[PDB]
Amino acid sequence: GLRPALSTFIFLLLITGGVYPLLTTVLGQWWFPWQANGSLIREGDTVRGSALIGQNFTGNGYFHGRPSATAEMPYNPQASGGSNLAVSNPELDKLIAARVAALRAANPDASASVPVELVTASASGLDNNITPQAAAWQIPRVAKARNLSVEQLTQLIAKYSQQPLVKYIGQPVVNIVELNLALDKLDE
Amino acid sequence: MAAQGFLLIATFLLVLMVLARPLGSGLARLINDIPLPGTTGVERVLFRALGVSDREMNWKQYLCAILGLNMLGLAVLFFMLLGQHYLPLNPQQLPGLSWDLALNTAVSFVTNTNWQSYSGETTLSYFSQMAGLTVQNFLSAASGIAVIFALIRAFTRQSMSTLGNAWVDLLRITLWVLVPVALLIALFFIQQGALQNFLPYQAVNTVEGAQQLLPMGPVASQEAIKMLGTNGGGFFNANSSHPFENPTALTNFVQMLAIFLIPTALCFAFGEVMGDRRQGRMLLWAMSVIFVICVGVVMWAEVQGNPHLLALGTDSSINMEGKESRFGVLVSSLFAVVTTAASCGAVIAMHDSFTALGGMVPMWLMQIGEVVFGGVGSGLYGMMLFVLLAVFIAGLMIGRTPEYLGKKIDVREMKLTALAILVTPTLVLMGAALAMMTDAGRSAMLNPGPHGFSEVLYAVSSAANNNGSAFAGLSANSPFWNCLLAFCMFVGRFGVIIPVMAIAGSLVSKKSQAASSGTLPTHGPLFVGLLIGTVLLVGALTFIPALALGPVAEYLS
Amino acid sequence: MSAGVITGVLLVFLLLGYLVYALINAEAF
Amino acid sequence: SRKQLALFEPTLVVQALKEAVKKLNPQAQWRNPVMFIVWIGSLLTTCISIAMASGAMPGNALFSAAISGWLWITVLFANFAEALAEGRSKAQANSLKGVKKTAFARKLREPKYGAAADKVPADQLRKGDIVLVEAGDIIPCDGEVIEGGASVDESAITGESAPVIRESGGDFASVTGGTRILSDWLVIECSVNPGETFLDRMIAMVEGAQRRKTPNEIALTILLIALTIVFLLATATLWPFSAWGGNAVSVTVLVALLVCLIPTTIGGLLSAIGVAGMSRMLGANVIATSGRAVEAAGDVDVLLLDKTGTITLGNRQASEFIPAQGVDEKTLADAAQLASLADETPEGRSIVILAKQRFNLRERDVQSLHATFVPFTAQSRMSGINIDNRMIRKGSVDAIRRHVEANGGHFPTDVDQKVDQVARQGATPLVVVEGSRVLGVIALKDIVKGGIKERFAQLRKMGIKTVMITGDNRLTAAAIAAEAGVDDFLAEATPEAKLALIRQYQAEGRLVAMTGDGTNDAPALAQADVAVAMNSGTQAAKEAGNMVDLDSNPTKLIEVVHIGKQMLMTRGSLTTFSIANDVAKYFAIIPAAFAATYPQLNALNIMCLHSPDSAILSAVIFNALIIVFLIPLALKGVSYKPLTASAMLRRNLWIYGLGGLLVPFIGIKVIDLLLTVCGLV
Ligand SMILES: CCCCCCCC/C=C/CCCCCCCC(=O)OC[C@H](COP(=O)(O)OCCN)OC(=O)CCCCCCCCCCCCCCC
Ligand SMILES: Nc1ncnc2c1ncn2[C@@H]1O[C@H](COP(=O)(O)OP(=O)(O)O)[C@@H](O)[C@H]1O
Ligand SMILES: [K+]
Ligand SMILES: [K+]
Ligand SMILES: [Mg+2]
Ligand SMILES: [Mg+2]
């Protein structure tokens, strides 16, 4: 009974490990080359990032995303993960208070009630998305830094805002990297 | 908020039932040894080439075939991880894994657990992910579905000593069900933004001027079988929260459907094979009622979230910590229940950052034996163990011999059912206790207080139940944790399969008795409530003391 | 390890073994 | 037999407490794994309390001695229920050994009545010994009557003083020792050596020295052991779990928690349900070989009943001599007498007796005619005398017609009409033929037992189909089936056909209940799963069948179904009650156990118990007291009602499922309040 056991395992290993992925790769690269290669954003000959991977924005003229609890530096794709901090852990309260104070000082013309997503780290540390209301909270800081009005920033946020097919399977989000990249072209 | 949550649950269940019914009919053909249309010609040539003659085998031979194939896969995967540096498709010269990490990873994927104490982007090569992990994602899932095929055949066969051919079942399940469905799911994932390539890591010059290195690899092909087979092993450390693995909410909705697709279709196939669709609907009703309540509690708990957020200066108290913006709190709550009621283990949110009550329900769902839709095949025969207890108690309370589907339940079945039910809780309590009495186990905690104990309890419960999800704050990449969880995963998987196969062997030789006037029906609200009560009461009473010292203490503090 | 922990582990192990043996041979029990 | 004593006789309650103390030995407790854990925990807490009293170990010695004392009460209460059931069982067994043996056996040198008898004590009698008895004496040993016929009083065994008829050559030949012969005399040939008497069958029924566990009890024990294993793991691992969050939970509390969690209520009462159910069989005048056959009566769907001897009283007496055309009544009696001169069957004797008053014929004897006799046989269905030249035969209509056709001749038209007429009311027609000439028919009147119609209605409501199997004529069987209330019948059934019917019913997987009285039913009684033999039948049927009914009631299966289902229902209901009792135990002990390690857990003290020490004590006290409070339920059993399966389960889940969730909450609260009032806590 050794021949059926060896032949079934070897054949299934070849199909699932050398035929199924090869067919998926060939069909994926033929039909959706851009998404299969990382949805890279390119200007000239240099890759500026991926449309799905968030970046660490710290300037005053840039929209800021959610905190990233990556190992070495914030928004590190080589170490993806969350903070895994419990509700009862006092270290989480210390981090939130620091983020609330930092956001409050950097946004003196906004409401004192900071949006919750801007003080909480994501589950992956590479979140490129914030809600439109979270992005609109940063408008007065970005508008003054970039010498823009509220009307143009709301239209630019809406241009880079995506919504799901139905309202209960997902949240409306804003592509931070794409919005910030377009913010550089508008200033140019 | 409540209306949005109700609509999300109703839409998920309605779409799942629509898709699972046609799949149940296809699975019924495989159970009845009827080849799918258009595959008769290919099967005849392939079976002869592989030396499979469709010879009927008893439960001992059927179990040995499953055990032999799993052991062969365990050895191949273990040595593949060790000699990974000598294998191709390694753009980053990652060295071979250590003995404890390789052993834990090889056992984890063979046992359909996919517990991961590493980060894939800096640990495993493309060859290891593709030829080592994805292969076991297909094989481990097919092994579980093959076992439930034998158990279902035992009920529907009269005075027979054989339960079909295991090699034929494994080939038919993988080639005609797992592979084609995963291919369609993977292609849909690629269109939405999932990775499918073999390029080296890509350097990124960010807008601010920092450096980002983007990992690559055939993510989408692994992702589809990871979801469909209730495997849960993520390509990257972030698992399903990673944008490269689950880019959009559309892919997330499909991921949840793929988790419950085969387990739901098996219940539909169970009714069709037995000739009474009410039996299959009874199992779904008991599973759905528990599942629906569990989602609502987690959704409610996460909506309240952190009470300190409002005082610290936020506009809302919703627990967005360890959650993705594109999914939201409600979707994250539903995924946590789906991935823990089932044996998938994939996470779109960090369960360690969940609220005390929000994380207790997923932990308790694993602890009850993974019977709320369970894993692929494992959930059905896991629920069959509780069904046998339910008919035994119901038969006694009506003064009749215990019976299910016309087959008498004897002492031998109760002996095996009791042993099978006792396997997983024994490992959870003994394994968690051993960690708490050792410095190595205790030092792995990240959070203090009762939540710290919850990290240890969650890890052992997930490994013993072959779930794979984790309170990721725990540092399990140690020889003690790698060996302890490997033992729990191995015993928790094959220690239930052996008694279940013995149950099928004893039941197949019996002859079903026609229902009389006094026969107790096994369908309807009364039996659904009894089955739900049997599952909940047994599961709760076992783990109340452990949960009291963990999430319950955290919630009340 | 404390001397009370050791004597508390064997006692549980003996009781579990006795109950497991009783379950396997429930006809005699 | 059938005279109940009490539930708590003072003579046996005090004797049950003495046996419960001697059941504390570890050898006795080793065979009950659930109660052995409580026994081990009681010793562990006793030793711990001794160490605290001596100062070797810090803690509260009084609290440990209070938990240990009630733990010893729990094992004593479980052994008291078992002793009470066994004590009541041996009381019935002692009542039967009390039957007087005359020891005055008049053994006969030769079988014929009238020989010299030598004084021999009863104990020396063995198989094959002929013993002569006279009116007013006691039958020495069980045997088959070989000659003579007289009334017998069986009030010693059956408990009823109504006389029965015992005579040789028929189904009334079987007799049992200890009964009192009433009227004339009998000549009994002993059939069983001492040690195999029917009385010994009844004793071994309730003695219960080494009781054999039924498969249902074994299957229930597996689940009870599995629950004990899972609760032992969930309690032992609690110590390292609590040791990390603060001070470890005390061993005494953990032992108290384990006892309250393990199914002590059903485990301590399981050995008392089986003995009590077997004792209720004796009170119903049913002698069952084993409890396994009793539990099989809860699944029977069809009941097979014999006509003559079981449904009817038997002893068919001829009523009128209906002659054929061209034959006078005087000629009919002469042929009838010849075929019944040596016929010892009850029908044969009635034929001879009825002819005497009608026509005072001279009493011919068999040796005077120098002829042989054909004995009646179930297969042949005919009997007669083959005298010189002339041939006289009688038997069933079908048997006679087939014999007549083979020899030659045709049944007269009037005779066929007469057969139908006498079979319409219920009398069995006997056709007597002289050579190849039909002489007439004889009507044998029979008496149907009273009250059988309503009892059969109860069986119909219970989902049990009643079928009357008999070898008699079809026309008379229908008039008896409609006079008894059975569902269907099967007439002209040979003894090999009744066995085939049972196998045919068993082929589909159903359970067949068969009751019979005659000797030809012995093969069909050993095949049915549930077999009940009348006490007025033969000894072969009594041993072949599973159970023996002392009241000779054809509808005695109703009582067997009651107790058989009661034992299963009591085990299931108590098991559900015990498991559901753990919910309140968790709400009473868990907040108390970790009152210092986790003060926030006190929010789960929904019962608002006074003290953490009083909370644990109240749970332990309730755990012990619930066993004693459910003793009458275990002895009497869960009440049976003729409901559907989905309605019986619903009612049992409402009384013991929901009731088991709520009773401990009230019980623990009341005990805690009483302790606070008395100042103990
Ligand atoms: C939690 C502790 C135990 C708790 C016990 C609580 C008892 C609750 C009982 C309620 C019944 C009252 C009826 C009142 C009227 C109801 C009207 C109605 O619509 O009822 C619809 C159906 C009728 O179904 P049917 O058409 O008659 O039957 C045809 C279908 N078989 O009842 C239902 O759904 C009722 C569902 C009841 C579920 C009970 C679960 C018991 C669990 C026991 C666990 C045992 C563990 C053993 C472990 C070894
Ligand atoms: N002593 C007898 N002599 C001749 N025929 C008899 C005698 N006793 C019974 N029979 C007839 O033989 C047939 C078979 O009887 P049996 O199978 O014993 O039926 P039952 O059990 O109702 O007596 C009956 O129909 C009856 O009429
Ligand atoms: K898994
Ligand atoms: K108890
Ligand atoms: Mg007869
Ligand atoms: Mg008869």
Numbering used by the authors:
A (entry chain C): 3 to 190
B (entry chain A): 1 to 557
C (entry chain D): 1 to 29
D (entry chain B): 2 to 682
Q: What do the study's own words say?
A:
Under osmotic stress, bacteria express a heterotetrameric protein complex, KdpFABC, which functions as an ATP-dependent K+ pump to maintain intracellular potassium levels. The subunit KdpA belongs to the Superfamily of K+ Transporters and adopts a pseudo-tetrameric architecture with a membrane embedded selectivity filter as seen in K+ channels. KdpB belongs to the superfamily of P-type ATPases with a conserved binding site for ions within the membrane domain and three cytoplasmic domains that orchestrate ATP hydrolysis via an aspartyl phosphate intermediate. Previous work has hypothesized that K+ moves parallel to the membrane plane through a 40-Å long tunnel that connects the selectivity filter of KdpA with a canonical binding site in KdpB.
In addition, the structure was obtained under the most native conditions to date, namely with uninhibited, wild-type (WT) protein embedded in lipid bilayer nanodiscs under active turnover conditions induced by the addition of K+ and ATP. We also determined a cryo-EM structure at substantially higher resolution (2.1 Å) compared to previous structural studies. Map densities in the catalytic domains of KdpB unambigiously show phosphorylation of Asp307 in the P-domain and binding of ADP together with two Mg2+ ions in the nucleotide binding domain (N-domain), confirming the conformation to be E1~P·ADP. Unlike previous structures, our map resolves most of the N-terminus of KdpB, revealing a potential interaction involving Glu161 from the A-domain, Arg3 from the N-terminus as well as Asp552 and Lys557 from the P-domain. In the current map, however, clear densities are visible at all four sites, likely due to increased resolution, but density at S3 remains much stronger. There are many side chain oxygen atoms in this region that produce a generally hydrophilic environment and our new structure reveals numerous discrete densities within this cavity. Because their magnitude is comparable to or lower than the surrounding protein side chains we model them as water molecules, thus producing a highly hydrated vestibule. Whereas previous structures show 5–7 discrete densities extending from the vestibule into the tunnel, our new structure reveals ~17 spherical densities in this region, all of comparable strength to the surrounding protein density. These densities, which we have modeled as water, are most prevalent near the vestibule, which is the wider part of the tunnel, but then disappear completely at the subunit interface near Phe232, which is the narrowest part of the tunnel and also distinctly hydrophobic. Our higher resolution map shows an exceedingly strong, wellresolved density at the canonical binding site along the axis of the unwound M4 helix, providing compelling evidence that, like other P-type pumps, the transport ion is bound at this canonical site in this state.
